[PDB]
Structure 1
């Protein structure tokens, strides 16, 4: 298996730990080996091995930001196939059932605001801007990939309604003021319950991290938990103007296509079908 193949590395990084006891979350680009208090990122393709140095450097930069919560901190890096040991953020995700409690929502939203605030502030820092990437015309490049790859798979009516969504992207300004997680899903935000009310342990999965528009992350929160909750976060954070709502609404439309676009490339039939549900 994957554990047997890397037993030499695991014996070094995790001395005495039985490899077959561990779990391996086979992600998209990396193969993270889940240990008790840490994980071990390994590149699947050769291209991922080339980016791992800067990825490791990026993760260290994120570790020195005041986000009001933990992030995977680099512990070790080398070769054998390059590797990166990151700290395991404790706590589990939060289901939408919990937000039905009003007092919980206040707390959860407030800590989300503190997180997004820290990300916003960090984007101003010159050091952070140099460390992290900031692609120009990511949406127009995205639109071209969608038009190339997904349009053939879509219906006539689906292409119309898709083109309207891609048309909206050109209206958006190319903002690069804040740090953007890029995939701020519910399962990527970990929480501490059973002590008091939920307390944000930390965020994980920063593979789509960049300097960009913070609406992207707000949209992700809205995709996870919905209208009423996002409104609460916007009102507390003071991001409830029309232009911000427009940017959020516009970006959220692409989430279905982004799922399909990725699934198309890595031959995921279940994801591709789900992403194209409306578009055919």
Structure 2
């Protein structure tokens, strides 16, 4: 035989327990710390994504995320995963075959490709898609049992994350003062919350052949919270010029803005160091921890 990374017999049995008959090519990504991700061919001739929780604490998150996606399906003008299997041992959905807005080889630190800066179709359709997401009524989020943060709770969560990093790591003094100044800067913070994706960047956005946004994936961080959460990565990837274009079109599409939104988004992006450090800490992974500590101690 030939040794292969995927355990085809175990994967077949797992899928079959949930009404899916695997047959044909599959691909496996075991780099995720919480899930194994397999793209598999099923006897319907279609590819399906198998999202396999690794541990009980991850399995616990399946049921609430399933309620989120069930609520979002009809309320977004783009596709989201259709979790036709959702249980503690397996999530599975038909693959949304459109490409992500970037392409990267598993394990690599460098993408092969990112949708270009000058793609007006991408920029525009991402802005309108984001306005549509942020227009989902909070009532619908409450009815779906989502995590809800008022503006005060949103700001408290950021404070709590900063304080946890301060307890566990040694942070550059200027970084600490930046975060504290932000937390104390009333004019930066929004006076409302919206449904956010929570982990939104080009790698979780799907596009058609023309580069028009057609879907979003990986909704595990979705909640009602600060809208700027979903704009930080756009600034990170497309710069201030990209952000300026996003905010103009987002507002024109009905997105609610506030005067210091662009500033707030930059502060949220800086806060990404906190998010990364807590991910590292909770992961127990020494390589991620090494990177986090180095970033935190470094002057920005």
Smaller-chain TM-score range? Answer: 0.7 to 0.9
Size of the aligned set, in residue pairs, is: 264
Deviates more, 1:86-95 or 1:226-235: 86-95
Residue equivalent to 2:235: 222
Identify the residue that residue 34 of structure 1 maps to in structure 2: 39
Question: Following the alignment from structure 1 to structure 2, what is the Cα–Cα distance between the partners of residues 220 and 187?
Answer: 10
Contact 1:259 1:272 in 2 (8 A): no
CA deviations 1:126-160 (Å, max 9, x no partner) are 12233221242211221121111222xx4xxx134
Once the two structures are TM-superposed, the CA of residue 262 in structure 1 deviates from its matched residue by 0.9
Report whether the alignment pairs 1:91 with 2:105: no
Offset of residue 259 of structure 1: 1.3
* 1:206 equivalent among 219, 237, 259: 219
> Structure 2: which 5+ residue stretches go unaligned?
1-5, 42-46, 103-112
Structure 1 counterpart of 2:165: 146
Matched, 1:277 2:295: yes
> Which shifted more, 264-273 or 220-229?
264-273
Distance 1:25 1:159, change over 3 A: same
Equivalent of 1:109 in 105, 111, 123: 123
TM-score by length of 1: 0.82
2:201 aligned with 1:191, yes or no? no
Aligned pairs for 1:1-280 within 5 A: 3-12=8-17, 13-18=19-24, 21-36=26-41, 37-66=47-76, 68-78=77-87, 81-94=88-101, 98-101=115-118, 104-105=119-120, 107-122=121-136, 124-131=137-144, 132-135=146-149, 136=153, 137-151=156-170, 154=171, 158-171=172-185, 172-173=188-189, 176-193=192-209, 197-238=210-251, 242-275=259-292, 276-277=294-295, 279-280=297-298
Q: Normalising by structure 2, report the TM-score.
A: 0.77
- Distance of 1:211 and 1:200 partners within structure 2: 22
